[PDB]
Amino acid sequence: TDWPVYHRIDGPIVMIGFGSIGRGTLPLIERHFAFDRSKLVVIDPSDEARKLAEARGVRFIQQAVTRDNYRELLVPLLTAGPGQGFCVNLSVDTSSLDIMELARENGALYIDTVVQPWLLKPEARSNYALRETVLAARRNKPGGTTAVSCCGANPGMVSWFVKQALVNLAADLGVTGEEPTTREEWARLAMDLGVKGIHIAERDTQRASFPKPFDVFVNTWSVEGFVSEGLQPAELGWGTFERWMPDNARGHDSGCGAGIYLLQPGANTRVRSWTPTAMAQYGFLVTHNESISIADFLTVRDAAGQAVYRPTCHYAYHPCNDAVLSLHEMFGSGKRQSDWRILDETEIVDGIDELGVLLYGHGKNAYWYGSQLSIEETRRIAPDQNATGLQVSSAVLAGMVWALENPNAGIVEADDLDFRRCLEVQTPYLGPVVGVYTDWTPLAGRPGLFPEDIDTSDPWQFRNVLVR
Amino acid sequence: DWPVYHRIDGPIVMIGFGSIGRGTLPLIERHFAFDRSKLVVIDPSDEARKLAEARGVRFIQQAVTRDNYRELLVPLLTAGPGQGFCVNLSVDTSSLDIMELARENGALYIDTVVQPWLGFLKPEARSNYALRETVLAARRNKPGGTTAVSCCGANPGMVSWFVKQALVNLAADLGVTGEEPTTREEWARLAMDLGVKGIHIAERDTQRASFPKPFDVFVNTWSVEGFVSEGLQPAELGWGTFERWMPDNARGHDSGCGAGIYLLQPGANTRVRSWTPTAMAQYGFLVTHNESISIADFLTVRDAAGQAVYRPTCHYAYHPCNDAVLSLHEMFGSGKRQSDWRILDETEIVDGIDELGVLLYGHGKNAYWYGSQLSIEETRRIAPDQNATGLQVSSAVLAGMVWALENPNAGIVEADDLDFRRCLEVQTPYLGPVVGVYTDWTPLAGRPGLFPEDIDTSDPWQFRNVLVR
Ligand SMILES: NC(=O)c1ccc[n+]([C@@H]2O[C@H](COP(=O)([O-])OP(=O)(O)OC[C@H]3O[C@@H](n4cnc5c(N)ncnc54)[C@H](O)[C@@H]3O)[C@@H](O)[C@H]2O)c1
Ligand SMILES: NC(=O)c1ccc[n+]([C@@H]2O[C@H](COP(=O)([O-])OP(=O)(O)OC[C@H]3O[C@@H](n4cnc5c(N)ncnc54)[C@H](O)[C@@H]3O)[C@@H](O)[C@H]2O)c1
């Protein structure tokens, strides 16, 4: 009845970054893998991180990993032996692709939760473009040591939820038969079910024991990371059903073809969305890797290679109340707050991180599938983190298990992993995982007091979702 | 001790006993001498009844409606022996109809808002410009007569007196010579000569509650029903002659004073870039307010032909308390009102201020904020039964009442028509720090930035730059 130990790691474990996610992932690595304790080392420039690592009894190197030092630092650490090591990258300000390629070159497994560069026109700031660098790297060097790109809660877990949700939608219609095996089969299942689009539909209700301080940005995970992505252009996977886009929307000349972006910051762009606890709510259209990767994954092309079916996919994020206030403060002031803080589990009085996928446009209108993990449950089952952190760290755990079980798979996205195996590892840490149908649409209660440019023939059009 | 300004020798009829009525009644008892059993409070709610009974004040548990207001109020207003005073602090009642009833029965009248009877509409008809035009027409139809003070709370109300004092201060600091204005035409000419392109009613409420905001509860420091109703009205502003651009969904008015436009979107979901001393640069919401129109109208200069050659832009730039910001996000994101609401009591507020002032911009010193920084701690020391928001309003009602008793045959008047020095002399003891602050901030601070924006770089204070689009 104790915790399962999934695998032995026969080489160094190098954790890059020991912020909110690193702190939550370390205890799960220790819990679920067998290895000599001295094999693990944490790298992070922060004094705060150093003091926590010392209290946890783990090796700690207080250094920022940079383009200038990453080869001389990471190659010896990852190749120390006797066997294959694992690079666990949970940092800000480091090049995911460069570290990934270095790990592969040296036979070390690799996982991260984001594609980002080393510490510029808007299209270059896009997660579409960054994802294209990873796809190109895979084409240049197929196969080889497994490296898992963007395997956190979102991007990451939500790709597995999309697959489970598609299977459930079919079953709820009385459609029986083997589930898809190939990418094209998954894409055709979405097409055949009439899925028009998908929101990554999230509502964080975690509340702090102190009121939000003036001129302090407050969040339940990285403030630096959230602000960085929130200032990037709004970004979405763009569905074939869409008949309207804003005047300030732009596409891409190259790549998989699945994305557009808007010439405005994602964290100041609102969309109409829905989760089970929030019901109808505003989300922020913050750019995310999975907005592109899920739309790409579910694309059906004709013989000529043109996409004839693709779902819309984007984030619709309602963060914790203090983060909502922090965004209002930041954008209203035109500048970042002087200080910031990430809520510790000891500072959260109650709440959940409700994180799921909202598939819409099919015969049952809309279906939300995801996790309702509470802070109370989090504290009972995993230390050193809040409910936001545990969804992410447990997804990293699942990706690490998959990579150790499938060590010769090359560069892979969350959409490439065995979703059933990953969810089997992750689900002890997700609290209630539920599927909920709703009849809500973005046109509920509309038109109202004022004229609006809506498309009443198709309630889920982005024209109706975007707050204008 | 506290000054007793005057005796009131007739009935005092208070319509509405919510957050503002509860804050105003103690000031009335404190600052006027009157037969105490001559005060009557009318409110439909049981909560109001219990509070009035606890004070031993006559109470009538009725909702004033178009169907009953004549039969209900006339006996109360004319009960004698002397001139009565109708103090209207309610939601859901016709300001104009009750004002006219008071006037034709010789009773003084004051309120803090122009609003219609609760309905059992074209966007233009929902505008405060239209509502104010019904009051202006009433004045033209019955000049002079018994005084009725329209829209004399904190804003609208006190901020009109702040605008006059700020113009005086700017004149001194910019070396503009001339005697203090004493007529509307002289005030308007002073604003023109100072180069005041526009005015924000620039407010930041930092009052914080001892409990976190509950899900599906709208929280505010004053009327939730009243704030939501005004926040769903069209965004609305006095429209200055310097403006070179208006949004595609802006509209004007065929008739009336000519000072206003409105936008075909709700004010409480419309953001503007603004500034207060404690907030520094912030978003405010462009909630419609009577003074947006009245201040712009008051400061209009016309040529001989009657065409406006100068007028300041004027509008609200409201940053309410944090729990109200979250309540608006919740309400607009859900597309419907929350199932419950609450107004923060002073006992529930841990700290904070209601920073309420006027931001005059476009002149030689860029921008100037003048107003009140009243804290909840100071409020509790000097006045009972209210928070810092309520006390700024209730003290303004007091000031207007003192002015009306000293000027009881002035006809229908707005806060812009009162003697601002006398009103501020009555109100200032309840306003805490009242300060003027210059800033170099403009709406183009930091702009253009990461993304292309439709800005006017020739003039930072253009509405094109202020409006969040
Ligand atoms: N996919 C997901 O679900 C998901 C969820 C949360 C976060 N993330 C990603 O992970 C990132 C980290 O999140 P977090 O909440 O732990 O952030 P955090 O801000 O709490 O921690 C970041 C850590 O990185 C360290 N760091 C900074 N520069 C470094 C360098 N050059 N080398 C090594 N370490 C460095 C900092 O000292 C800090 O301790 C986020 O910015 C985000 O991109 C992904
Ligand atoms: N000018 C200003 O600065 C300013 C400031 C605050 C409020 N106001 C105005 O004053 C109004 C009242 O403010 P509040 O905070 O006291 O509101 P509130 O919601 O606390 O109280 C309103 C009261 O009116 C009563 N009421 C409802 N229908 C009625 C009717 N038909 N007849 C008589 N009473 C009735 C309610 O029972 C309630 O007690 C607001 O809606 C707003 O328009 C103006």
Numbering used by the authors:
A (entry chain B): 2 to 120, 128 to 476
B (entry chain A): 3 to 122, 128 to 476
From the paper:
Bacterial HSS is mostly found in α-proteobacteria and in some β- and γ-proteobacteria, including pathogenic strains such as Legionella pneumophila, Brucella spp. and various P. aeruginosa strains, including PA7 and PA14. It catalyzes the conversion of two molecules of putrescine (PUT; 1,4-diaminobutane) into one molecule of sym-homospermidine [HSP; bis(4-aminobutyl)amine] as the main reaction along with several side reactions. Bacterial HSS is NAD+-dependent, active at neutral to basic pH with an optimum at pH ∼8.8, and shows increased activity in the presence of 50 mM potassium ion. BvHSS forms a dimer, with each subunit containing a boot-shaped substrate-binding pocket between an NAD(P)-binding Rossmann-like domain and an HSS-like domain. The cofactor NAD+ is bound as a prosthetic group in the binding pocket with its nicotinamide ring being part of the active site.
An ‘ionic slide’ (residues Asp94 and Glu117) was proposed to lead positively charged amine substrates from the entrance to the binding pocket into the active site. The activity of these BvHSS variants in relation to wild-type BvHSS correlated to the negative electrostatic potential of the exchanged residue in the order D94N (61%) > D94K (52%) >>> E117Q (1.5%) > E117K (inactive). The deeper lying residue Glu117 consistently had far more influence on the activity than Asp94 at the pore opening. Due to a lack of interpretable electron density, large parts of the ‘track-and-trace’ loops are missing in the BvHSS variant E117Q (residues 123–127 are missing in chain A and residues 121–127 in chain B). The shifted side chain of Gln117 is thereby moved away from the entrance tunnel and does not cause steric occlusion. In addition, the electron-density distribution of the NAD+ molecule was interpreted as alternative ribose conformers of the nicotinamide riboside moiety. While the ribose moiety in the wild-type structure is exclusively present as a C2′-endo conformer, both C2′-endo and C3′-endo conformers seem to be present in the BvHSS variant E117Q. However, the extent of the above-described structural deviations is rather small and should not exert significant effects on the activity of the variant. Instead, the drastically reduced activity of the BvHSS variant E117Q is assumed to be caused by the lack of negative charge at position 117.
